């Protein structure tokens, strides 16, 4: 494995949990950053390394990024649609840590709304989308090998590995399962073909 | 009317650098106040006059404002997430220097959060937004000819010169390219129509 040690940010979240499970099964040595109050469930798969802290603390992000081959970012605000900078400021700390530690590959999830006409983004999601836009700018400007993953609705359908990946535009379906989205984040570790592109994974579950 | 000499504050910032370059290419005689001259580009368009100093030092500001026809303010304190008064104290120094040297025109950048409901502000941006509000009041109460430029997200898109400007309200998208924002800063030097108004520049970048 050319990529074997990875940091996952957001591993306790909807997509992070299945991404972690798939990564451990695939043989990755995974380091996670978890907030003190929200640890990984005791029954689930165990990462190799756990850092307890906050993506808003440069020190905690540095500890998580040190020694890795690549970074997966699945940060979010769960059900909370309020104005926030946690994703963009978290990305700022991640970029600084990758540069300091010689890590180049970052696969980071924002949203397909970054490929929408802004006048059609639902107003209830505008505040979160605003921080996705801020995040994407931070990562694009970093000069790192950045894969911008921009999914549409994240659903509960199965892992298929059969989804479409649309480059630099909206794809033909409006859903991706959380399991397939995690599968795609990990696929991006094994190829350079999506570096510098936006990617829209989607599938028809049938 | 004929503005030929301008001071730019914040010329080494994201918007400042392109405003400066555009001003020099268009023929303005530009004076900049910079804390570190190595943060100015060594190649291409270069300002006519460089004052090395700090906007918090009244004598440095006075030396920058002396002899100008108008002032552009693109100050910012990106890293401050808790109460901060750099921009508003800078604006007090600028206003005092403008009055002492007979400079009547100031075009200054705050943010579109000043046009929207306060709960739109992400918590980590509350402090900078409070100081934007303080700087806006300093400039409004000065009696100077003041164009308040209140942009949304500042993006990276190429200069278009085709953006929308809405007066005393919001408008189309929630993004303006730094290049288009700089272009609009300079357009405000050539007209009185925005004096005493708030302006919201935005555009759709396809
Ligand atoms: N739901 C959709 O249909 C959809 C569609 C497109 C895009 N998106 C975006 O896709 C991304 C992933 O969504 P998701 O549903 O998988 O994520 P999620 O369930 O909202 O999980 C968010 C993850 O980020 C962690 N996190 C939040 N703040 C943190 C902080 N300060 N420090 C460290 N970790 C922090 C959370 O940890 P905790 O356990 O401590 O909370 C959690 O692990 C999000 O950005 C979302 O906006 C979602
Ligand atoms: N999407 C956005 O980022 C956004 C959106 C809406 C509004 N705004 C606001 O737009 C304005 C311009 O934003 P920007 O991103 O273009 O600015 P920026 O890149 O953060 O640049 C800030 C400028 O102000 C200078 N500065 C800071 N403190 C100074 C001091 N004590 N003395 C002299 N100069 C000082 C900086 O000089 P140094 O190079 O020496 O640091 C730099 O030139 C800001 O006020 C910002 O809050 C930004
Ligand atoms: O909390 C949430 O629910 C949430 C939802 C989103 C939805 C993103 C999206 C983009 C493009 C799409 O086409 C569709 C669709 O079609 O369903 C959905 C983004 C961020 C979120 O935090
Ligand atoms: O530190 C920073 O980077 C910073 C960023 C800002 C951004 C303010 C703003 C206003 C209206 C907006 O719509 C949006 C958007 O859409 O992203 C953003 C302000 C002050 C800052 O110091």
Author numbering:
A (entry chain A), B (entry chain B): 1 to 206
From the paper:
Biliverdin IXβ reductase (BLVRB) has emerged as a promising therapeutic target for thrombocytopenia due to its involvement in reactive oxygen species (ROS) mechanisms. In the pathway of heme degradation, BLVRB utilizes NAD(P)H downstream of heme oxygenase(s)-1 (inducible HMOX1) and -2 (constitutive HMOX2) to reduce biliverdin (BV)-IXβ to bilirubin (BR)-IXβ. Consequently, the BV/BR redox cycle, under the control of BLVRB, plays a crucial role in regulating reactive oxygen species (ROS). A large-scale transcriptomic analysis on essential and reactive thrombocytosis cohorts identified biliverdin IXβ reductase (BLVRB) as a regulator of platelet production through MK differentiation by controlling reactive oxygen species (ROS).
To this end, we devised a new chemical scheme to replace the diazenyl bond of olsalazine with an alkene bond, resulting in the creation of olsalkene (OSK). The crystal structures of BLVRB bound to NADP+ and OSK were resolved at a resolution of 1.7 Å. The crystals belong to space group P21212, with each crystal asymmetric unit containing two BLVRB molecules (designated as Mol-A and -B). Notably, a specific region of BLVRB, situated within the vicinity of crystal contacts, exhibits considerable disparity between Mol-A and Mol-B. Particularly, the structures of drug-binding pockets display distinctions between Mol-A and Mol-B. While the OSK-binding pocket structure in Mol-B is influenced by the presence of the second BLVRB molecule due to crystal contacts, the structure of the OSK-binding pocket in Mol-A remains intact in a monomeric state of BLVRB. Consequently, detailed structural analyses of the complex were focused on Mol-A. The binding site of OSK closely associates with the nicotinamide moiety of the NADP+ cofactor, where the xanthene ring of FMN adopts a similar orientation to xanthene-based inhibitors like phloxine B and erythrosine, as evidenced by NMR titration experiments. A primary driving force for the binding of OSK is the ring-stacking interaction between the nicotinamide moiety of NADP+ and OSK, along with hydrophobic interactions involving residues S111, F113, W116, L125, V128, P152, and H153. Additionally, favorable interactions are facilitated by positively charged residues R78, K120, R124, R170, and K178. Notably, OSK displaces the sidechain of W116 (as observed in the FMN complex) and shifts it toward the binding pocket by approximately 2.5 Å. OSK exhibited high affinity and specific binding to the substrate binding pocket of BLVRB with a KD of 0.140 µM, akin to the previously studied OSA.
